[PDB]
Design an enzyme around this catalytic site. Structure first.
Site, PDB file in Angstrom:
ATOM      1  N   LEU A 171     -42.736 -16.084  66.096  1.00 41.36           N
ATOM      2  CA  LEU A 171     -41.984 -17.217  66.687  1.00 41.36           C
ATOM      3  C   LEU A 171     -42.676 -17.647  67.981  1.00 41.36           C
ATOM      4  O   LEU A 171     -42.558 -18.823  68.337  1.00 41.36           O
ATOM      5  CB  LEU A 171     -40.542 -16.777  66.954  1.00 41.36           C
ATOM      6  CG  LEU A 171     -39.674 -16.568  65.716  1.00 41.36           C
ATOM      7  CD1 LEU A 171     -38.220 -16.369  66.111  1.00 41.36           C
ATOM      8  CD2 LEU A 171     -39.812 -17.737  64.757  1.00 41.36           C
ATOM      9  N   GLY A 172     -43.368 -16.727  68.651  1.00 44.03           N
ATOM     10  CA  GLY A 172     -43.985 -17.089  69.935  1.00 44.03           C
ATOM     11  C   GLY A 172     -44.663 -15.952  70.669  1.00 44.03           C
ATOM     12  O   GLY A 172     -44.646 -14.823  70.163  1.00 44.03           O
ATOM     13  N   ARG A 173     -45.259 -16.262  71.821  1.00 36.48           N
ATOM     14  CA  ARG A 173     -45.935 -15.267  72.644  1.00 36.48           C
ATOM     15  C   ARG A 173     -45.270 -15.276  74.022  1.00 36.48           C
ATOM     16  O   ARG A 173     -44.403 -16.102  74.308  1.00 36.48           O
ATOM     17  CB  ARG A 173     -47.437 -15.572  72.796  1.00 36.48           C
ATOM     18  CG  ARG A 173     -48.246 -15.641  71.503  1.00 36.48           C
ATOM     19  CD  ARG A 173     -49.099 -16.900  71.406  1.00 36.48           C
ATOM     20  N   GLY A 174     -45.682 -14.329  74.866  1.00 38.84           N
ATOM     21  CA  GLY A 174     -45.275 -14.258  76.261  1.00 38.84           C
ATOM     22  C   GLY A 174     -46.354 -13.539  77.068  1.00 38.84           C
ATOM     23  O   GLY A 174     -47.419 -13.229  76.523  1.00 38.84           O
ATOM     24  N   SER A 219     -45.110  -9.815  75.658  1.00 39.46           N
ATOM     25  CA  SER A 219     -44.397  -9.698  74.386  1.00 39.46           C
ATOM     26  C   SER A 219     -44.921 -10.660  73.326  1.00 39.46           C
ATOM     27  O   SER A 219     -45.502 -11.692  73.640  1.00 39.46           O
ATOM     28  CB  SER A 219     -42.909  -9.908  74.544  1.00 39.46           C
ATOM     29  OG  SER A 219     -42.605 -11.261  74.889  1.00 39.46           O
ATOM     30  N   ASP A 255     -35.902 -16.218  86.411  1.00 39.01           N
ATOM     31  CA  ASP A 255     -36.805 -16.967  85.502  1.00 39.01           C
ATOM     32  C   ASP A 255     -36.009 -18.045  84.761  1.00 39.01           C
ATOM     33  O   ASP A 255     -36.225 -18.207  83.556  1.00 39.01           O
ATOM     34  CB  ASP A 255     -37.530 -16.031  84.536  1.00 39.01           C
ATOM     35  CG  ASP A 255     -38.856 -16.577  84.039  1.00 39.01           C
ATOM     36  OD1 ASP A 255     -39.390 -17.491  84.687  1.00 39.01           O
ATOM     37  OD2 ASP A 255     -39.337 -16.082  83.007  1.00 39.01           O
TER      38      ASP A 255
HETATM   39  N1  LIG Z   1     -34.119 -13.678  72.581  1.00 40.26           N
HETATM   40  C1  LIG Z   1     -33.995 -14.512  71.807  1.00 40.26           C
HETATM   41  C2  LIG Z   1     -33.923 -15.582  70.860  1.00 40.26           C
HETATM   42  C3  LIG Z   1     -32.866 -15.911  69.998  1.00 40.26           C
HETATM   43  N2  LIG Z   1     -33.151 -16.926  69.196  1.00 40.26           N
HETATM   44  N3  LIG Z   1     -34.438 -17.274  69.544  1.00 40.26           N
HETATM   45  C4  LIG Z   1     -35.197 -18.227  68.909  1.00 40.26           C
HETATM   46  N4  LIG Z   1     -34.663 -19.051  67.960  1.00 40.26           N
HETATM   47  C5  LIG Z   1     -35.450 -20.140  67.361  1.00 40.26           C
HETATM   48  C6  LIG Z   1     -35.214 -20.508  65.934  1.00 40.26           C
HETATM   49  C7  LIG Z   1     -36.473 -19.813  66.329  1.00 40.26           C
HETATM   50  C8  LIG Z   1     -36.499 -18.316  69.347  1.00 40.26           C
HETATM   51  C9  LIG Z   1     -36.969 -17.486  70.371  1.00 40.26           C
HETATM   52  N5  LIG Z   1     -38.295 -17.591  70.754  1.00 40.26           N
HETATM   53  C10 LIG Z   1     -39.015 -16.926  71.764  1.00 40.26           C
HETATM   54  C11 LIG Z   1     -40.343 -17.249  72.019  1.00 40.26           C
HETATM   55  C12 LIG Z   1     -40.991 -16.596  73.055  1.00 40.26           C
HETATM   56  N6  LIG Z   1     -40.410 -15.660  73.840  1.00 40.26           N
HETATM   57  C13 LIG Z   1     -39.110 -15.358  73.571  1.00 40.26           C
HETATM   58  N7  LIG Z   1     -38.581 -14.220  74.302  1.00 40.26           N
HETATM   59  C14 LIG Z   1     -39.152 -13.548  75.341  1.00 40.26           C
HETATM   60  N8  LIG Z   1     -38.348 -12.627  75.795  1.00 40.26           N
HETATM   61  N9  LIG Z   1     -37.185 -12.681  75.027  1.00 40.26           N
HETATM   62  C15 LIG Z   1     -37.355 -13.630  74.153  1.00 40.26           C
HETATM   63  C16 LIG Z   1     -38.376 -15.965  72.550  1.00 40.26           C
HETATM   64  N10 LIG Z   1     -36.210 -16.577  70.973  1.00 40.26           N
HETATM   65  C17 LIG Z   1     -34.943 -16.482  70.551  1.00 40.26           C
END
Ligand SMILES: N#Cc1cnn2c(NC3CC3)cc(Nc3ccnc(-n4cnnc4)c3)nc12
Length: 331
Positions: free
Chosen positions: A44-47, A50, A155
């Site tokens: 779904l993504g980077r950080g 993470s 943040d």
């Molecule tokens: N936590 C959480 C969370 C719930 N739904 N959701 C979704 N829902 C969308 C339909 C796809 C995307 C996403 N993406 C990301 C991307 C990058 N970093 C983070 N992250 C970093 N640290 N915690 C989360 C989340 N994070 C979340």
């Protein structure tokens, strides 16, 4: 002979009244679930710290999000976990559902509730005046809750807000920079995205508090109502303060640094200069006008102050006239 101390105006001593275990996260022993309950569907993504994936919990068939941690100091992992456990069930706070470890890699992973997000670059353009007010109120619920529970997020920015617009559902995510507020404590100022950094970070004042989050909320609001993303667009941390000074003016900046006796970086001497405090109208145009109201500007002005003690609290913000339509509708 030193900078002047600060205490939070609200929720100052809340962690002091708690059992040590609540905030002393280095003593937290982590309760590990079963890694085989979760199958990764896709990335779904980077950080910075993470990689994030959609997954399936195979025991209930619930959709889930998995944050696989890059190597970071174990202290910082226990903090995010502790903070997430403390806040669980709070309004508009993401739910931590589990914590697992690869049995071979030994890389830890946090498992969260899934939110059916619509990315902010597409969503924000569709947003009515009322929507902005509604979602801003939803964010403030989360901030008042976490502040009241002794926690600064540090943040707050659009990437860390998940909105399922269909169900009018908001979750504040990524508690990986979050910290416990303790009066007296001097914090790392190398936090938050550049465009959302508060003046206290930019001038290296370390004895900051919850009100940091209220600045960053202000940055969000500004970009949404003025349809200018980001609102304060610095080239670096120095120019970031200048971009702010060109708007809030330098007079209040120097009164701020005077009030707290802040040793200003020598390098600011050249670039800061002398600037007037601008009026909000300089940012209104025909495209964004339908989002801007006197209420919105009054609200924004009271978030965006140099002096952290002088910014609205989350609860005070929720009581502002900008939200009267929203508060009436929720009853
Ligand atoms: N936590 C959480 C969370 C719930 N739904 N959701 C979704 N829902 C969308 C339909 C796809 C995307 C996403 N993406 C990301 C991307 C990058 N970093 C983070 N992250 C970093 N640290 N915690 C989360 C989340 N994070 C979340």
């Amino acid at each position: 002979s030193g900078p002047v101390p600060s205490r939070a105006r609200v929720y100052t001593d809340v962690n002091t009244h708690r059992p040590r275990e609540y905030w002393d996260y280095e003593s937290h022993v982590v309760e590990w679930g079963n890694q085989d309950d979760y199958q990764l569907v896709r990335k779904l993504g980077r950080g910075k710290y993470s990689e994030v994936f959609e997954a399936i919990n195979i025991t209930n068939n619930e959709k889930v999000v998995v944050k696989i941690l890059k190597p970071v100091k174990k202290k910082k992992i226990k903090r995010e976990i502790k903070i997430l456990e403390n806040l669980r069930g709070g309004p508009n706070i993401i739910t931590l559902a589990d914590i697992v470890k690869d049995p071979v890699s030994r890389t830890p992973a946090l498992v969260f509730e899934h939110v059916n997000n619509t990315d902010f670059k597409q969503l924000y353009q569709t947003l009515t005046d009322y929507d902005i007010r509604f979602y801003m109120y939803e964010i403030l619920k989360a901030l008042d809750y976490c502040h009241s529970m002794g926690i600064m997020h540090r943040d707050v920015k659009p990437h860390n807000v998940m909105i399922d617009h269909e169900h009018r559902k908001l979750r504040l995510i990524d508690w990986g920079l979050a910290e416990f507020y303790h009066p007296g404590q001097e914090y790392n100022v190398r936090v938050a995205s550049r465009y959302f950094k508060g003046p206290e970070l930019l001038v290296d004042y370390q004895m900051y508090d919850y009100s940091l989050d209220m600045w960053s909320l202000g940055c969000m609001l500004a970009s949404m109502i003025f349809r200018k993303e980001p609102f304060f667009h610095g080239h670096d941390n120095y120019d970031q303060l200048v971009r702010i000074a060109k708007v809030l003016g330098t007079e209040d900046l120097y009164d701020y640094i005077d009030k707290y006796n802040i040793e200003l970086d020598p390098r600011f001497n050249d670039i800061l200069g002398r600037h007037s405090r601008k009026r909000w109208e300089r940012f209104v145009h025909s495209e964004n006008q339908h989002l801007v109201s006197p209420e919105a500007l009054d609200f924004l002005d009271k978030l965006l102050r140099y002096d952290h003690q002088s910014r609205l609290t989350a609860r005070e913000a929720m009581e502002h006239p900008y939200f009267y339509t929203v508060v009436k509708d929720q009853a």
